Amino acid sequence: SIGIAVILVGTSDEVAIKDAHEKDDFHHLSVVPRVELVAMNETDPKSIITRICDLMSDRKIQGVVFADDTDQEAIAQILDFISAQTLTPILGIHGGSSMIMADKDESSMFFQFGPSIEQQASVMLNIMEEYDWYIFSIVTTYFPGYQDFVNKIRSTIENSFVGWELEEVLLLDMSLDDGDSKIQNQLKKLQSPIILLYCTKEEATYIFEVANSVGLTGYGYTWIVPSLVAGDTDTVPSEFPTGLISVSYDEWDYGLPARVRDGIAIITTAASDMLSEHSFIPEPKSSCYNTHEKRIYQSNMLNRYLINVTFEGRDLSFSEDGYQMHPKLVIILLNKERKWERVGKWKDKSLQMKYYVWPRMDDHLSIVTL
Amino acid sequence: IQNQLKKLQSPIILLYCTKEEATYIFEVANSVGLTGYGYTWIVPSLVAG
Amino acid sequence: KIVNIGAVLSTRKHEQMFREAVNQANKRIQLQATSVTHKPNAIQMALSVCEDLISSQVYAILVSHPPTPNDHFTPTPVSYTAGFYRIPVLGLTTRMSIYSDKSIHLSFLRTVPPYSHQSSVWFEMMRVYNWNHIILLVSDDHEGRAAQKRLETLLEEREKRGPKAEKVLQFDPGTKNVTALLMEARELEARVIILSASEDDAATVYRAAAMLDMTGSGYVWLVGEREISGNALRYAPDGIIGLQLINGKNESAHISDAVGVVAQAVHELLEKENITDPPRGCVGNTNIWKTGPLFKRVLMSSKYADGVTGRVEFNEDGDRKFAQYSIMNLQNRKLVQVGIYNGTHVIPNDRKIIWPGGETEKPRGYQMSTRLKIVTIHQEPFVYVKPTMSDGTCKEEFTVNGDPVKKVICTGPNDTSPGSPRHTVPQCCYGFCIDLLIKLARTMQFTYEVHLVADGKFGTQERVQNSNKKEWNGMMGELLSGQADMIVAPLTINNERAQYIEFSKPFKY
C-alpha cells in the first residue's frame, strides 16, 4: 500500500478525490492509494511539524500532498527542513502560495506547482515578440534571484537574431531618500517603453507611486512583472496602473482537485517504478526522536526516480530544483475595471493571444493594399 | 507639468517667470530628474534678476 | 521593562558564562536571560525553541558552533522558526559561507567572516609580491563557487599588467584522480597555485602534488584554514602558506561580544517611537512583528559595540567586517605567523619566511616557456598535407628556382577519417603559412611543434539549451582550451571572433 496524505490548512476543499481508487490504473499489484485527507485550522510551525510526525508514524507515509491558503516562504523552508531531517518527500500541489519557485538544498526534492523565473522571462519575451516591441530595460532592487534572472534574460537575448536592445540594467535598493532621488533620475533617463521588475507587493506599490509621480503611467509605458512576487490576490492597489501583464500558474484553469490528482498520480507512479525496479521496499522509520535511526539514509535517493516519471499520458517530469516540466500556465492581464482577466494562455509553449493585436487604450487608421 | 517635462526630451529649455516660480520649477525639475548634467537652460534676466 | 533574551547553548558551562555576562552587562530598562540546551535532532530543537518562544519572545536569538563540525544543522531550524515571524537570529561561530544568504536567513549577523575574507586577503597578498598570474582551483560546489565569484568580483576592479587570471578549474570533493587537472596546471606558465578544497580533498591534492613534485622552489602556495588540519598535514609538504583568523575557538569571548552587541542593539531600539514587541507565543502568531525590520535596520546602520573582535563593523551583507587574520606558514611543520592582516593594514611580522623547496629568495613570476603548440587546418593554397616516406621524412622536392621546400612534420588526426578517428603517424606538411611560421621562428628563436585539428571547424560559437552556455568548438576551441598557443592557419577576421581572442596585423587582403 502507498501512504499518501492530503494536508489542508486555512481553507476547506473536501472533494471527491476518493475516485483515485475507482480509476483503477495501477498495473502493479503492490501499491494501494491509502489516502488520508487530514485537515486543520491552525498554521503554527510546531503544531504542523508535530502533526506531520504523527501522520508519518501512524501509517507508512511516503508522499504528502500539501495545500494551504497563506502566503509565505516559511512553508517551503520547513518542507526542506523536514526533507533533510526525516528524509520524507512531499508534494506542494499548488499549496495555496506554496507553488512559488524557491531555492532548496540537497534534501529530498519536493515538487512545487510553479515554473522557474527563467520560464517567466522567456514567455514574457515571447509575448513582447508577439507585439514586436523589441525594446526593453531592466529595473530591479536588491531582491533574491535578480542575478540569475538577468543572466537568463541576457542569455535569451544572445540566442536570437532580432535587435533586442537592453537599454539599461538597474540594481537598486530601498534604503533612504537619496537613493530614491537617484532611482527617480535613472528612471527619467530610462526612456524605455517596456520595463521589468521583481519585488514584493509593498515595494511594487511604492515604485508604481514614484513612477506615476515622475511621469510613468499606462499611456505608452507598459510593464511586465512576474506573478511570483506580484501575486493574484484579486485586489490590486491604485498604484499599479491598468497596463501591467503577468503570467501565473493555472489556478483559474487547472483546478485544485486536478492538481492534487496529478500529484498523487505522480507519487503513485514513482513509487511503483521504484519498488518494481529496485524490488526492495525501504522501511520508513518514523522516529522523530531517535538519532540512531538516521542510518537509514543509505538507500538510493528517492528524488532521482521521483523527478523522472510521468502519468496520465502527459509529460509531468520535474526539474532538479523541483519545478514543473509542463506547459499551460495562464497569461493574466488586468483590465481597466481593476480586475484580472485571462486574455492569453501560454499552453503547449505557445502564445494563445487574441484579437491579433494588443488591445491598447482616433490616430489608429487602417489601410488597404495589393 | 511633470508629465509634460518628462515628455520634453530637449536639452535646451527657455522659461520666463518670477524668482519664486523659478525656484519652484527648478525644484520640481531636479525632482523629476532635470539637472545641470546635460540639460542647460536659458532664462531672461528681466524675470530672473 | 525586562527584555529576557532567549539563548541556546551547546554546553551548560557556556550557559552559566552567558548568564554571568548578561548579569555584568545589565549595568550598561533591564534584561533577563532565558537559556536552553541543544537537541540532538532538529525536531526537538524546534519544539524547545517554540517552548522558549512562548515564554518571552522578546530577544535576538544567538547561536554558537557545536563540537560537531556541521555547525549548520543546529542553527538552521532556530533561524527558520525565527524568520517565520521575521525574527532576527545571531551567529557567533559557524561556516558563514553557506549561511551568508539574505533570502534563506532573514536577519543573520555572523561574528566570524566567511572564506570571502580569505579570498580578499589572498588578493591583498598577491597584490604585494607582484605576482600577476595565479592557477586557482576549487572542489566544493557551493563554498568554492562563492569564493570564485568573490575573487572574480575583486579582480573586476582596476577599470603594470595586473593579475587577472590564468585558468579556473573545478573538481569534486570525493575524487581521487585530480592528477588530470594537475597535469594541465603544471603545463601552464605560472607556478602560483591557490586551492580552497575540503580536508580529504586537500589531502588527496597534496598526495598528488607530492607524486608530481610540485614544489621546485617556484610553486607558491596559498591555502585556507579549512585545510591546515593535521589530517592534511600528514600529506602536506612543508613551505605552504596557511591562514588562521583571530578568535578562532574563543567561545567565551564570542559570547561576550554577542551579549555586548545585543545590549547595544536593545539600547538603540528602545529609544525609537513605535515599539511593537513580538507576542510571547509560537502558536497562532502568523504575523510580522514591527520591531523586526526596524531592529535589523538600526542594528545594521551604525550600531558598533566594543568587545573582543576590536572595532567590529557590519558590512552590507550581515557579516562582521574589519577582522584580523594571522598570516601563518609551514616553516618546517611550524605554524609561525609571518604577519597579521587586519582591515587594510598589510603588516608582516618581519620573520625569516622560507618558500617551499628550500628556496630562500622570493620566487619570480611565470617561467617563459619557449615552446608553442600551433593548430592549423587543411587548405590548399596555404598549408599542404602530404604523407611521409618509410623512414619518417618526406621527399625534399624543389621548384623552378631550385630552392628547398623546407617542409616540417606535424602530428595531426590528419591521415585518419571522421569515421575511424585515431592518432596518426605524424604527416609532413608545408606551404605558405608554414614558410611564414619558419620566418617567425627564425626571427624569434622558437621551438615549435605544429599539428592539425580534429574535425576542421575554422570556428563556431555553438550554443544549446542543455547547459545554457555557448562554447567555441574547433580550432578556436582548442586555442581557448589551453592546449594550443596561436593560430597560423588562414583565419579570417570579424567582430565575432575578436571578442574572445585578439588578432594581429594582416599579411594578406
Curated annotation (Swiss-Prot), chain B:
Modification note: Phosphorylated on tyrosine residues.
Free-text tissue specificity from the UniProt record: Expressed in the hippocampus including the dentate gyrus (at protein level). Detected in adult olfactory bulb, brain cortex, hippocampus, striatum, thalamus, superior colliculus, with much lower levels in inferior colliculus, midbrain and cerebellum.
Residue ranges that the Swiss-Prot or TrEMBL entry lists as coiled coil: none
Entry's localization field: Cell membrane; Postsynaptic cell membrane; Late endosome; Lysosome
Family: Belongs to the glutamate-gated ion channel (TC 1.A.10.1) family. NR2B/GRIN2B subfamily.
Subunit structure: Heterotetramer. Forms heterotetrameric channels composed of two GluN1/zeta subunits (GRIN1), and two identical GluN2/epsilon subunits (GRIN2A, GRIN2B, GRIN2C or GRIN2D) or GluN3 subunits (GRIN3A or GRIN3B) (in vitro). Can also form heterotetrameric channels that contain at least two GluN1 subunits and at least two different GluN2 subunits (or a combination of one GluN2 and one GluN3 subunits) (in vitro). In vivo, the subunit composition may depend on the expression levels of the different subunits. Found in a complex with GRIN1, GRIN3A and PPP2CB. Found in a complex with GRIN1 and GRIN3B.
Domain comment as written in the entry: The extracellular N-terminal domain (ATD/NTD) endows NMDARs with a unique capacity for allosteric modulation, harboring several binding sites for small molecule ligands that act as subunit-specific allosteric modulators of ion channel activity.
Role noted for this protein: Component of N-methyl-D-aspartate (NMDA) receptors (NMDARs) that function as heterotetrameric, ligand-gated cation channels with high calcium permeability and voltage-dependent block by Mg(2+). Participates in synaptic plasticity for learning and memory formation by contributing to the long-term depression (LTD) of hippocampus membrane currents. Channel activation requires binding of the neurotransmitter L-glutamate to the GluN2 subunit, glycine or D-serine binding to the GluN1 subunit, plus membrane depolarization to eliminate channel inhibition by Mg(2+).
Protein name, UniProt field: Glutamate receptor ionotropic, NMDA 2B
UniProtKB/Swiss-Prot annotation, chain C:
Compartments where found: Cell membrane; Postsynaptic cell membrane; Synaptic cell membrane; Postsynaptic density membrane
Membrane topology, as annotated: Multi-pass membrane protein
Modification after translation: NMDA is probably regulated by C-terminal phosphorylation of an isoform of NR1 by PKC. Its phosphorylated state is influenced by the formation of the NMDAR-PPP2CB complex and the NMDAR channel activity.
One GO cellular component term: cytoplasm
GO terms, molecular function: amyloid-beta binding; calcium channel activity; calcium ion binding; calmodulin binding; enzyme binding; glutamate binding; glutamate receptor binding; glutamate-gated calcium ion channel activity
Sites where a glycan is attached: 32, 177, 213, 250, 274, 324, 342, 414, 445, 465
GO biological process: adult locomotory behavior; associative learning; calcium ion homeostasis; calcium ion transmembrane import into cytosol; calcium ion transmembrane transport; calcium ion transport; cellular response to glycine; cellular response to manganese ion
Lineage: Eukaryota, Metazoa, Chordata, Craniata, Vertebrata
Keyword Magnesium applies: yes
Name recorded for this polypeptide: Glutamate receptor ionotropic, NMDA 1
Covered range of the whole protein: 25 to 535 of 938
Disulfide bonds: 50-282, 394-428, 410-429
Protein keywords: Calcium, Cell membrane, Disulfide bond, Glycoprotein, Ion channel, Ion transport, Ligand-gated ion channel, Magnesium, Membrane, Metal-binding, Phosphoprotein, Postsynaptic cell membrane, Receptor, Signal, Synapse, Transmembrane, Transmembrane helix, Transport, Zinc
Gene: Grin1
